[PDB]
Structures are given as structure tokens and as C-alpha cells.
Symmetry: D2
Subunit: 239 residues, 4 copies
Amino acid sequence: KSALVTGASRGIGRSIALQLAEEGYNVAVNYAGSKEKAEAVVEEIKAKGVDSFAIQANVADADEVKAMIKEVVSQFGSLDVLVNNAGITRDNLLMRMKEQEWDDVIDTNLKGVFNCIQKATPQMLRQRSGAIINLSSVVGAVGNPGQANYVATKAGVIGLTKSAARELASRGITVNAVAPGFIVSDMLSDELKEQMLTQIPLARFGQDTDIANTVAFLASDKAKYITGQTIHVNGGMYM
Amino acid sequence: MKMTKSALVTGASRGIGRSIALQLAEEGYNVAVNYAGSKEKAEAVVEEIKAKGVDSFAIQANVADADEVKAMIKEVVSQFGSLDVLVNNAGITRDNLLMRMKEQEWDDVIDTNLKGVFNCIQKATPQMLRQRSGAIINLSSVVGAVGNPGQANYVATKAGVIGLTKSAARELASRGITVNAVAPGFIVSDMTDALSDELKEQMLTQIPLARFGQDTDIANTVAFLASDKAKYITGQTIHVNGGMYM
Amino acid sequence: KSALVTGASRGIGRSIALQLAEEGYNVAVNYAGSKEKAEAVVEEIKAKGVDSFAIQANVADADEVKAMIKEVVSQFGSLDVLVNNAGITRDNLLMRMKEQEWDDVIDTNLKGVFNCIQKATPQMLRQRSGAIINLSSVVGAVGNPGQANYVATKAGVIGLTKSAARELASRGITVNAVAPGFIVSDMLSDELKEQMLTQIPLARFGQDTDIANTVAFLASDKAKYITGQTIHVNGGMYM
Amino acid sequence: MKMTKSALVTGASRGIGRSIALQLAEEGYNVAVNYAGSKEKAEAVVEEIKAKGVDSFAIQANVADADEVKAMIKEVVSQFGSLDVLVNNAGITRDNLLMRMKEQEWDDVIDTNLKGVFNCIQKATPQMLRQRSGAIINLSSVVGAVGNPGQANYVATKAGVIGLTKSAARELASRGITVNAVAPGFIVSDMTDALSDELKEQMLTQIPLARFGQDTDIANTVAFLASDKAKYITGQTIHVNGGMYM
Ligand SMILES: [Mg+2]
Ligand SMILES: [Mg+2]
Ligand SMILES: [Mg+2]
Ligand SMILES: [Mg+2]
């Protein structure tokens, strides 16, 4: 069994890769930025006793994504789990937001998930199996001032999740999303943090591992009847 | 008669956009009719609107183009003196199976449907902040909430529009502006009718009221959200779909 | 056209009745408590140029509700709009909540809506038309400490709304709900109110008329294709 | 082997409740098996559970009865020393068309399904506050989210259970307790099979995965929520339904 995680060089992506490796998956580590950080994650994954390698690719670019999937399948022999975790923010108030701030976030976060799903589908259709897990965010469900672009993409990812789920269900593929709340890795002044904590019933920020554990559950045989769903992992801030 | 309040409707040359424009006119709004291609259809709608006794004119703009949208808003505010209601109705489809969908089919739908809504909201914002009032109503779709095979691009945009609705709602609320969405179900005017009766039959089985909806059903809900009757409603998506999604 | 509004002697119920009367509806005013307050509402309604009368009935009691509907139909000739607005709270923390605090709220708020819908259905089926509008609450969607009973009923009312909508749609009846946020009539220290205001994007409490306007829209020909829906009227506190 | 952690499952003598109990046992929880009527079935499940290597016993209680529930919780805490997981699975149906449904059909379903869940949560609360930890998982249903003709009572309770889930979640969060719900779709064990294949065919058309689910699908999700893997998930309803509702 083989998995690919996008934007896996650090934070939630890395934790996801490490957890999948803990479950017995071979894991390909996609990255955009630092090679050495990605290579370190690959070594951490190998320490779990599975195979791993890093692949550089901009998920916004359909050609690069196609080459990425082809390499994973070439190397691992299959593609059983795809985790679309890569994402960026370029925050600004509505009136101040630049066109490139919109475009960059939409192409990376929304088109990137589409690209990865699209390029992975032919392999999964031939397998007649697969699990795709997309990362959304609590703000995709509730909105947030200053992030109109990011919110649009994470809500859009939920819609894409549902559509892909309905389209691919007949061929044995599940498609789900995980929406983190306020997670320590993603983390500000202690004053701002204090206010954010008042929004959270559990009264603490979540950890990378909370997100990774949920993704791993969705990628497992234990979740084979779950599809089209968004699992909110947010300490109760949105219910 | 030039009304004290004015509306802009995007993609208003036919179907749902046209009925919305006509309904806003009936409610006493001057209405600007935006169109992309067919000027003749837009100008006929303008005449229908003036027959209601309000002012109207047609404006050509591609909503995906930030600069055309800015010029469009400036022209509406210039002609009418304000922009009290913005209805983001313009949208296209480029349907295809996931594994076949062309990059251009994805891009065009995202730019018109999602970026278009962002552009219109962004460019309208300064005027509405100046007014300390306004209503923005965005058109989504039932498929934005439930997904639909063959429409992954369109679905992504209509879900994205609901997100954008909530974000703009939170950002603009404190200055007196509401932002909401309406999600039509299966509406007769959105159908080519090229599809067989058996396909119609199947779609009808999804709808408890066992009929397709009409443009006016959507228009009436938009007009409600655009009225003082709905001043405490914001960030909401109103589904008008005969019960097919609850 | 004839309407019945439960718990209409004051607050949101009264405002709803007055608005329906403004729309040309004859309106029956159901009440549980003070007769003179209800009679005053009936006079206010008559001032709009429509017919009106008050009926005493505990909505938790199926016999009394049956007699209530029968009287409305007898008097008006039909029952075109039913607004289930009657509801109570008996707040307490989970560990402190008494059995009667649970039972009273469930029977009034949830069984009461069921009773009214059930007893109204035979008339509406014979008409092959009608609009039923149930009152929920933002807390039905988000929960609230100290109101486990109330929350259960208002979420339950949403479920009942959907089920009735699906069951009655084929006979020309729509069934919808309206969920108010924090409304001035329902209203505390200015300190508590200040905190509640921080939960509301519009930064103000809503008014009875906001709820009444939405109910009136749902009861009108303009909403004939809307059914099974919950309309949140809450200034953006829940989206 | 007596585990360090213990679970109570209501209505666990068969179907979904039984699979949940067995799955929790496999995860290393001592499991108490609650039943209302059939003691023989409950005791057989107890033996299946002990075969997994954990402790188990059967307890009779009507969940609608606050006093029986209190005695039940006391007995579990007494036997096991704690109550770390509470699964509120017990529930009944009394189906009928709206205009025909008997008052007793409404009352019995509300008392068992909705009041029963409240009673169990209320009586478990003191022990879990004492522990400063615990997981409560409530069983809802897809029909709680979408409605279903002929089940207005059952639907009201399953929607009510989601509300109760969110309210208890908010109230208990600060003291280390999570409260979530699982909403099964159409599961083979919930069907009498008395229904025709054509009725089955129709139900299958609502499900993208084009198969009914199994008890184990529900059990696995409950076990996930009951684990340390889900400590930051609270107030949520997880739909396990093959895509029929998204
Ligand atoms: Mg024409
Ligand atoms: Mg559109
Ligand atoms: Mg047996
Ligand atoms: Mg149950």
C-alpha cells in the first residue's frame, strides 16, 4: 500500500506522512520549498520501516502533478491513498486584497486539489480502489474576515470532495475531507491566543497529531463506508 | 421615476438573472442589467424593467475581469447615485467527467463563477461602506451543497461562493451590509430540455414537491433578502429546491 | 386565508400574528397564560381589518390541540398557515436538571409541535395546501451549556420539520422552520449582553419583527418552492 | 485480564450495539452490555466479549427510567472502577404516517431514544467529571439529518440527539470529556428483510457506494471516537452512510 502526501515537509503534512508510515504505508513526500526539510521527513519515515522518497512539485501545475503521480506509481506500484494537504494563505481585508493574492491562493489550494484528484483518478480507477483525503479548515465552514480567498478555497474543497465522492464511488474510491480548527503547528501574541482559546470548548489548541490521526482513520479499511464527508477536528469551536 | 434605491444584477439577460432583475424592479429598485455577450437580450430586459416604472440600463462586463467590474460599478453608482443591492448571478458551466475535464474548462468556470463573485464584492465594497448599508446576494446551487458527477468545476465554485458569502458577511457586518446566498435546485430555465424525459423523471424523484421550480421562485427569495424585511439575516444560504436538499 | 399562531400573546408570537394580519390573514391567537393579554393582541389584529379570536390551549395536550384546530376551521373555514411558536425554557446544568425540567420542555416544545402538525394535517390534506412554520433557535444548531433540554427540542423541531416536509410535500403542503438568534423580546446585565454582542457580526440584537417578517415570507405564495428548510435569522452568529 | 479502561454500551444485545461492544473489547475496553428485554442474547454477547480477553457483564435497564439508569451506572463503576466510554445506542422505532401515529407511539420513541440518551449522559456525568476524562458517543441516524416519511417520531429523536450531543459537548468540554454522535445510513442489520427487493433497489439508488453498510462500519467509527486518536474531536456527528448524505 502506497500513499502520497502533498506539502508534507513540515507541520500537519509531515505529521500525516509519519502517521501513515506508522500504519504500514509506503509514503511519498511532496514538497515545494526546502529539499533538505523534505529529505529529513523521508528519513524519519524510513525509520518506521517503510519506503519513502521526496518529490518536488507545484500542485497548481497540472503537468508537474501528472509527473508526480506517474513517479509514485512507477516507484511504489500503486497509489492507494492521496492526501491533498498543500495550501497557502495570503491574507488581506477585502478592499486591500491584490489580484495575485486571490489567484495564488485559488490556484494552489483549490486548483491544486483538483489537479491531484484528476491525475490520481486513472490509477485508482484501474485499481478500483483508493482513498482521497483533502484538507479543509474550520474557516471554510464559518468564514473569517481577512481571508476571503482562503475561505473560498477551503469551502470549495468541501464541494469538490462531495462531487468527486459521488463521481468515483461506483469505482470503489472514497473521497473525504478533514477540517482542522486552531492547531499549534499552524500557529502570535499570547493576547490574541487567549481570545482564540475562548472560541474553543476544549479550551486548548489542537496538535498536528490530532489531524494526522483522523486522516489515517479515513485512509484505513475501518472507514470504507465513509465518503463525501468533512470531519471537523476543532475542539468544538464549530459543530 | 428614479427610485431612491438601486440594484445591479450580473448575468441578467435571461433566465434566473432576468427574473431577479424584473422582481427587484417590481420592488422599486432601479436596476442595472449586466451581460457578457448578448447585448440585444440585455437591452430588451432593460425595456421590460423600465415598463415597471423604474430606471434601468445595460452594462457589458466580463465579471472575471477586475478592471471591467470596477468600471461597471463606477458606472452604476454614477447613473443611479448609489449601489444598494448587488446580485451576483452570472455563472457558466463546462461539464465533463473528472478524468477528462480540460484545464481550460476548470479555469473558465472558476474565474467566471468564483473570481467573478469576489471581483464584484470587492469593487462594490467601498460604495457600500460609504453608504453604511447594502445587500449582497450571491447565487449558489443545490449541487454546491451535495456535489454532482460531471460538474466538479461548477460544484467547487458554488461551494466556494457559500464560503465567500460567509467571509464577506463577517467582514462587512459591522458597517451595515448583509451578504447572503440563494441556492436554486432544479429550475426549468436552467435546462436545455435536450435531455430525455427519463432523465427528467429521474431528477423529479429527488424532489419532494415533485415539480421543477421556476425562475420566479428564485427571484422572490432574492427580492426578500434584498428588502428591509431581511436586515438581520446575514451569512446565510437559502435553499429554494422543493425539498431535494434539507 | 386563515392562520393560527401558538403562544401568540406576547413577544415573537404576537409580532408574528400582527405581521400575518398585515398580510391579509385572519389570525387565531393561541395562548396558555393570560387571557387579557391575548385579547389585547386580538384587538390589535382586528385593527388591521382582519378577523381574529383567542383560543386557550396547552399544546402539549393532543385533545386540547385537536379542539383548537377544529375551532379555527369551524370559525375561519380553513387553516392555511400554522405557526408553531409556543415554547418554554427550564434551564439548568446537566447534573442539576430535574426530571420535570426535562419533561416539561420536551412535551411543550417538541411534542407540542408534533401535536399541532398532526391535528392540522387532516385539514391541510383536504385542502391540498398549507404552510407550516416551526420556531427553532440558534441554540438548536450550536448547543448551549445549561439548556440541554431546550437544545434537544429545538434540534428535534428541525428534524420534525424535515420529516413532515417530506411526508406532506406530495399533498401541496410546505413545512419550514425559523431559528432566531439573540432577540430583544426574548431578553440581563449589560455586562452579559456585551459578551453576547461579541458573538454577533451585525453587532446588535435582533427584533421580534425580524422573525415575524421571515415567517410571513415563508407563509406567502413567494415561498411556495421552499420546504424542509431552516432559516437562521441571527445577525450572522451562526452560518 | 481487567483493563485499565471501561465502556458501557446501551442496547448492546444485537446488531449495531453488539458490534460496537465487540469492537471496544478488541480495542482493550472492559465492556458492560446493557439490555432491556432479552437477557439470553445479552449474556451470549458477554461471553463473546470475554473471549476477547477483557471483563464484561450484562445489566438490565430501561434507559427511559432515570432510576434504573442511575443504578446501572453505579453498578458499572462499581464492577470496573471507572466509566471511560459511554455509548448511547439503545433506540426503538414505532413507525406510522403522521396523521395516524398514536400518542403512545410518539411518547415511547421520545422517552427511549431522546430522554434515554439524556438520562445516560446525566447519570454518567458525575463520574466522568471526577475522572476529568471520558468519551460519550451517541447514535443518531441519517434520517435525523434528512427526514423520512412515516418516521416523524424517530426522526425527531435522532435530530434531538444531535442537539443534545452539541449541548453536552459544550458543557463538559472544559473538564476533559468529549461528546460526539455517529449517524448510520442504511445498515443491513437494521433491516427486517421483510421488505421487497424493489424497496431495497430503491434505497440502494440513494447510496453512491451502491451497497448497504455493515454493523462493523458503525462499530469502527465508534471505536475511533472512543480512542485517544479522537481527543480533539467534540460536538461532531460522523455520518457513515456510503455517501447518501454529505
Ligand atoms: Mg429570448
Ligand atoms: Mg450562477
Ligand atoms: Mg441471535
Ligand atoms: Mg439507536
